[PDB]
Design a protein around this ligand. Structure first.
Ligand SMILES: Nc1nc2c(ncn2[C@@H]2O[C@H](COP(=O)(O)OP(=O)(O)OP(=O)(O)O)[C@@H](O)[C@H]2O)c(=O)[nH]1
Ligand SMILES: [Mg+2]
Ligand SMILES: [Mg+2]
Lengths: 20, 296, 84, 368, 51, 108, 330
RNA sequence: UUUAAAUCCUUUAACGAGGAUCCAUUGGAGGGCAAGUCUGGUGCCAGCAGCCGCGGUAGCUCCAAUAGCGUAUAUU
RNA sequence: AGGGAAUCAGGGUUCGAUUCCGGAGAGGGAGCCUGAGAAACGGCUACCACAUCCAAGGAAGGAGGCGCGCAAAUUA
């Protein structure tokens, strides 16, 4: 019943360009 | 050269001082500070309330309900309210809260309710926030405990302004937190200063301590569904209030105030004196919905 | 039995919600759909639609007595000045 | 919760306060006990003036015209052109627009067609000279903040034209006007339309003959416009303004009789009468003119919840009633403290008006 | 940091897609776009200039 | 010349956004569109500041408080407009870069 | 006198002289005789003015009694007060729970009214789904919590506001809806459903309130489609856009174009079929091309305002509050 | 094991890797697009720019430094 | 007149180590008591200055943190 945070919230990467 | 460097350093210090000037509308005698306690549903919200109350008053309280008003120091009073996991109630308190105590489970980590309330605070005006994390007793005083403290702190500093204090609660002695940590926590609440929020300054508002029904009892037996006249008591906050005005009660609807009248202040501040500490006379608890001593 | 004051407003509110929900599941009118042809719309429908559009070129000027009198004034002035 | 009122007197201030507060008003029994029971034409033209400068309003008029129901909408600016009725002067409508100009959604650029100068209503020369600086005291100052008179008109022909433009402001700055000061200069404006230009000069030597002993510095302007600028009826008049050290302005004005009725007024008699009327104005002098008291009181109530003080002369019956409407609409009551000024030999006693403003801002302004 | 703003915006590389001919007019041929008509338009302009 | 520069010897300056002159005019240049008008707090001077990228105008509304820094180099990068000497860095003490990337939320 | 016949009278703000002075004798002239003349930065000055007003506000009504002070300035902050409210619903008192706080927020001028509210809106970065236009959504604005139907629109450079089907994924967007009047510059928050618990983030979107008005003025793009049937070099005959010769008369001179990008002009109606017309073009068309004309059609929003009454619920079900469902749920 | 007791350091049993997604960043410079919007002309063009299109809501390339890397003012 | 002064130890140039003091005071200037050693780091009286409790009669007393969106070692 516990709502743990997702991976996106934990590391607020946001709009960062994708690199190889 | 050095005076040029000293000149440039002072100007950068002045830049931080610059802000839009505004009339200072704070009351000469401010009302009690509203302190909200929230967190995940089983984090220990109600345990912290009792420890804070026992730190200041020595009065026994059982079955805590509604806001509780106590005197904490010579020049400051506090109103203590608990916020549940309900989304509707979480929104209302963010409008009225002056101080927010956020509870975090260190072993489990962050949860959804911690982040949702922070976003609500940013929408409706950001109050002063101090994060308190519990359940630190599970770790074994090792690299794991050291890194968990640092990891949770850095993620916390992005949500709030940098330097917002994060407080640690080590463990429970006999179902209560240690006396030293609670005393240090009470010192931080005492010494804060608060910025004026735009919405709270513009509109008068009241957090009602007591509710009373004022109708003719024969009307109720006639029709139980009749509209009822109800009287409420509270501390006036924000701005001035006129005799005839429109008020909105969230969760009920809009109403117009019929009559307004002031009363002598309960849980009032002491007349000034130079005793080192406040004696048992000055420490007062006003809790009309809670039950003080034994009577509820 | 007797009905409460609040329930009466709820009864009115539920009727309004019921009608609004029907509109969502109903097909959209031809005005709201983009790219509508002649067959879909009813005959002579656009005569009352009051749509907004643009014209390619300027319309031709209309001759009236006011233009005639103004133009005669220009000729009369030049005749007096002999500005041929 | 709508207010209820009876009668056609004080009609303008009831409509002006209703649109600012947002509360509907009902007016009943307009000229019930009269041969003509209906609403007058100039009052109806005022309602049409509100309709064009507002957005979303609703107006209900009885077929008899005895009762009126007015539901206020939001204030919307832009360019508006109106034809004022010739029965009442342009200044009759301009007082209401001065109350509503700074709170518009778009800056108001309005041109008014009608009669400019009249004996009944305050002249537009007076409003430009005195009322316009008063709004600058509240911070309504701006580059386009002007009144310009394109053409003059006199009754019954009228046919005059004025243009009015005012900036928009989010909030009103508080004021503390408690020192009137001493009068430095007297400036005056003389106008003659559809008559000999000599009438204006015969005004000048009469007013100057009286006022020269009090002050060395008096200069009277003379105004003569030709052609369609003059209007459709003849007449002449004089307006006088006195300027103080503190920046306050006190004014009085008179105009000649209309052609249709009344005996012709000797220009020498008109000059002395206006000069004496200005002298009585100084005997009651305060921070604001008696005409502009009700304008000043409204703007103090609309501040950002601050204490504001103004020193004004004896209260006219118009302002006394206007203070009563403010308590009904905005629930604000002033604190009144008269000043004896017994031995200072300034003149008649003055009244100090102080109050705390209600929280009020321009809801119409668009945030971008 | 003007380029830094540009790089973040171009993180998503999905480009707008083209629409095809409606089915009930399929036998007529392909719906020509600006890229196709430009081939036919420049062809005419070259011949008329030569004549 | 210790107080020669318009910032009064400081590296940055704080101002109130008066209006967006670029958006108010309807030219879709995107070099005109990124011009805002601010009034520095320290001395009250009115200057025109630049927003780094169109779409950061959305985060700024009227009467906000911004931090303005100089525009030392790369003035020729913007297309044919003089007076490119100032740029907006922070709004409400939050970086424009942080807001655009979705890394922070502006606090009211 | 102020605070303790006349009707049907002239409305003039002029003070008539009840008793004028002679102004010929010297004694009356004497009473009027005195009335005539015989390095800090801008930030420091602005602070200096504000501090002056700060003292004046506090030190004005101190002398008067508290009962007097209530009349002049109202009930000041910090005073314990008692309020009587009438016409409270019966369900409030019967189902009262002390844990749920009760808040009384004073309303400003005109805030009781309803109107058209324009907002700047951005979908929250952590919300999984997007918000569809013309579906119910709950807003938390000011003091209130209510559910309405919004219109999402995007601004153009010329100033036109065109309707959007959905909220953009990472851009700000305008929003318009019918609801209570709220002062500008305030923040607002949107949820989809208060009742029930969701594993994911529940905050839908966040923004600020921009404008208050009574007209939405929003438009939607509408294209009428036609197909050629006879081609004469530039000039081509078009059918399928219109269906009457009266109709074509309305739209003469309008600008039309093909999918290919050739711009054209409507010239004159044709009689041989019902609704065809003659249209010239920049260059020769093909049979496969499709012509269309771009027109803008104003839209409207239903006036639906449903305030939340979570306190008017039994003690057990204060969480479960329901209203209109969205299109997907239906 | 350490130590007054405990932590830390050193030994050491058992789990712990294929997109090994157990996913390095900061700054600079380029490419790609529709029945999309605006502005100006030299018919079919150019600039600016483009998560917004008719209906529909259930992760391109190159360069420099690398757990480090820029900007602003003064300056040498 | 924070600064010194010295001292020991040393193969890859010493990011070594430590000590030694000039006095005075205990809310302010005087008087007084003990002991081998103090005109006391501690009692008392008078005067001066503070502040606390009370049934209003009387009684008992002798140092640092913030002002940089920021106060836990002011501890165990
Ligand atoms: N071990 C440990 N347990 C804690 C701590 N803090 C709270 N708890 C647990 O929390 C329980 C108390 O529950 P509550 O006082 O009701 O806390 P709550 O979060 O308000 O729960 P609700 O009242 O249901 O909302 C105790 O039985 C503890 O087991 C802590 O710091 N350490
Ligand atoms: Mg609890
Ligand atoms: Mg392998």
């Amino acid at each position: 019943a516990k709502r743990a945070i997702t991976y996106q919230i934990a590391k607020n990467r946001g709009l960062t360009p994708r690199r190889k | 050269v050095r005076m040029a460097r000293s000149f440039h350093r002072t100007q950068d210090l002045k830049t931080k001082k610059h802000h839009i000037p505004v009339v200072d509308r704070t009351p000469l005698e401010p009302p009690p500070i509203v302190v909200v306690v929230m967190g995940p549903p089983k984090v220990g919200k109600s345990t912290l309330i009792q420890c804070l109350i026992r730190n200041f008053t020595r009065q026994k309280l059982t079955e805590i309900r509604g806001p509780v008003t106590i005197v904490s120091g010579k020049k400051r009073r506090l109103t203590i309210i608990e916020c549940g996991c309900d989304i509707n109630m979480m929104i209302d308190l963010a409008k009225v809260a002056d101080l927010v105590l956020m509870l975090i489970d260190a072993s489990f980590g962050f949860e959804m309710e911690t982040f949702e309330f922070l976003n609500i605070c940013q929408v409706h005006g950001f109050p002063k926030i101090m994060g308190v994390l519990t359940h630190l007793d599970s770790f074994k005083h090792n690299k794991q405990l050291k890194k968990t403290k640092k990891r949770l702190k850095h993620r916390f500093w992005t949500e709030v302004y940098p330097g917002a204090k994060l407080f640690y609660l080590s463990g429970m002695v006999h179902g209560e937190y240690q006396n030293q940590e609670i005393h240090n926590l009470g010192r931080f609440i005492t010494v804060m200063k608060f910025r004026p929020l735009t919405w709270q300054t513009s509109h008068p508002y009241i957090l009602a301590d007591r509710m009373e029904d004022l109708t003719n009892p024969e009307d109720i037996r006639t029709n139980i569904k009749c509209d009822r006249k109800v009287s409420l008591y509270g501390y006036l906050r924000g701005a001035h209030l006129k005799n005839k005005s429109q008020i909105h009660m969230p969760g009920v609807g809009d109403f117009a105030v019929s009559d307004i009248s002031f009363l002598p202040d309960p849980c009032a501040l002491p007349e000034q004196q130079k005793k080192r500490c406040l004696n048992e006379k000055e420490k007062l608890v006003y809790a009309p919905l809670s039950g003080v001593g034994g009577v509820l | 039995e007797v009905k409460s004051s609040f329930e009466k407003r709820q009864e009115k509110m539920n009727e309004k919600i019921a009608s609004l929900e029907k509109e969502l599941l109903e097909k959209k009118p031809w005005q709201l759909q983009g790219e509508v042809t002649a067959q879909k719309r009813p005959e002579n429908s656009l005569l009352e639609e009051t749509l907004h559009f643009d014209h390619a070129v300027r319309m031709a000027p209309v001759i009236t007595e006011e233009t005639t009198l103004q133009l005669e004034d220009i000729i009369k002035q030049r005749i007096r000045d002999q500005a041929w | 919760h709508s207010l209820s009122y009876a009668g056609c007197n004080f009609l303008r201030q009831r409509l002006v306060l209703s649109t600012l507060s947002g509360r509907p008003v009902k007016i009943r029994k307009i000229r019930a006990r009269d041969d003509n029971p209906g609403l007058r034409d100039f009052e109806a033209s005022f309602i049409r003036l509100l309709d064009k400068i507002t957005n979303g309003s609703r107006i209900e008029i009885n077929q008899t015209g005895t009762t009126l129901y007015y539901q206020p909408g939001l204030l919307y600016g832009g360019s508006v052109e109106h034809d004022c009725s010739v029965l009442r002067g342009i200044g009759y409508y301009l007082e209401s627009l001065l109350c509503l100009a700074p709170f518009m959604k778009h800056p108001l650029k309005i041109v008014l067609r009608g009669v400019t100068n009249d004996q009944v209503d305050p002249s537009v020369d007076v409003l430009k000279a005195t009322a316009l600086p008063l709004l600058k005291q509240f911070g309504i100052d701006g580059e386009s903040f002007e009144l310009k008179i394109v053409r003059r008109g006199m009754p019954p022909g009228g046919g005059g034209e004025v243009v009015f433009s005012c900036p928009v402001r989010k909030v009103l700055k508080p004021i503390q006007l408690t020192d009137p000061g001493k009068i430095k200069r007297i400036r005056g404006m003389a106008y003659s339309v559809r008559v000999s230009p000599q009438m204006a000069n015969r005004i000048v030597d009469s007013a100057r003959s009286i006022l020269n002993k009090f002050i060395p510095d008096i200069y009277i302007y003379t105004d003569h416009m030709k052609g369609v600028n003059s209007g459709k009826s003849p007449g002449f008049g004089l307006s006088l303004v006195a300027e103080t050290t503190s920046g306050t302005f006190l004014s009085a004005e008179l105009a000649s009789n209309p052609q249709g009725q009344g005996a012709a007024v000797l220009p020498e008699d008109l000059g002395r009468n206006c000069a004496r009327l200005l002298l009585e104005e100084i005997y009651r002098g305060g921070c604001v003119d008696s005409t502009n008291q009700s304008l000043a009181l409204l703007l103090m109530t609309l501040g950002q919840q601050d204490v504001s003080k103004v020193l004004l002369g004896p209260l006219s019956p118009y302002t006394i009633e206007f203070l009563r409407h403010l308590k009904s609409f905005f629930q604000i009551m002033f604190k009144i403290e008269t000043k004896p000024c017994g031995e200072e030999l300034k003149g008649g006693d003055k009244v100090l008006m102080t109050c705390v403003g209600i929280g009020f801002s321009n809801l119409s302004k668009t945030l971008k | 940091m003007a380029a830094a703003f540009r790089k973040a915006a171009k993180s998503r590389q999905r480009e707008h897609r083209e629409r095809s001919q409606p089915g009930f007019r399929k036998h007529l041929g392909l719906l020509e776009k600006k890229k196709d008509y430009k081939l036919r338009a420049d062809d005419y302009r070259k011949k008329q200039e030569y004549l | 010349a210790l107080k020669a520069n318009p910032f009064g010897g400081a590296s940055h300056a704080k101002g109130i956004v008066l209006e967006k002159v670029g958006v108010e005019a309807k030219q879709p240049n995107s070099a005109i569109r990124k011009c805002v008008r601010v009034q520095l707090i320290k001395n009250g001077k009115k200057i025109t500041a630049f927003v780094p990228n169109d779409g950061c105008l959305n985060f700024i509304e009227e009467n906000d408080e911004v931090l303005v820094a100089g525009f030392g180099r790369k003035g020729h990068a913007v297309g044919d407009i003089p007076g490119v000497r100032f740029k907006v860095v922070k709004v409400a003490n939050v970086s424009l870069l942080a807001l655009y990337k979705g890394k922070k939320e502006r606090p009211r | 006198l102020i605070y303790g016949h006349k009707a049907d009278s002239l409305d003039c703000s002029r003070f008539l002289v009840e008793a004028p002075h002679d102004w010929d004798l010297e004694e009356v002239m004497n009473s009027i005789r005195d009335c005539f003349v015989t390095e800090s930065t801008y930030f420091d000055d602005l602070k200096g003015e504000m501090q002056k007003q700060a003292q004046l506000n506090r030190a004005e009504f101190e002398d008067q009694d508290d009962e007097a002070r209530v009349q002049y300035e109202g009930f000041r902050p910090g005073m314990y007060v008692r309020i009587e409210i009438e016409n409270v619903p019966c369900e409030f008192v019967q189902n009262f729970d002390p844990h749920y706080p009760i808040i009384l927020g004073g309303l400003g001028n005109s805030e009781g009214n309803v109107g058209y509210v324009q907002m700047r809106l951005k979908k929250h970065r952590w919300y999984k789904k997007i918000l569809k236009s013309r579906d119910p959504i709950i807003f938390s604005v000011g003091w209130r919590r209510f559910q309405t139907i919004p219109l999402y629109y995007i601004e153009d450079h010329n100033g036109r506001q065109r309707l959007l089907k959905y909220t953009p994924q990472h851009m700000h967007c305008g929003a318009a809806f019918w609801g209570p009047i709220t002062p500008q510059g305030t923040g607002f928050l949107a949820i989809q459903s208060v009742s029930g618990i969701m594993p994911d983030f529940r905050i839908a979107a966040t923004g600020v309130v921009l404008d208050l008005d009574k007209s939405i003025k929003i438009v939607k793009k509408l294209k009428l489609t036609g197909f050629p049937y006879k081609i004469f070099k530039n000039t081509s005959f078009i059918k399928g856009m219109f269906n009457s010769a009266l109709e074509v008369a309305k739209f003469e001179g309008a600008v039309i174009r093909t999918v290919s990008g050739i711009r054209g002009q409507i010239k004159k109606a044709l009689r041989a079929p019902e609704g065809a017309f003659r249209a010239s073009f920049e260059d020769k068309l093909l049979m496969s091309d499709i012509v269309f004309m771009r027109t803008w059609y104003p839209v409207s929003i239903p006036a639906f305002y449903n305030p939340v009454t979570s306190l008017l619920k039994p003690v057990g079900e204060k969480d479960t509050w329901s209203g209109m469902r969205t299109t997907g749920q239906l």
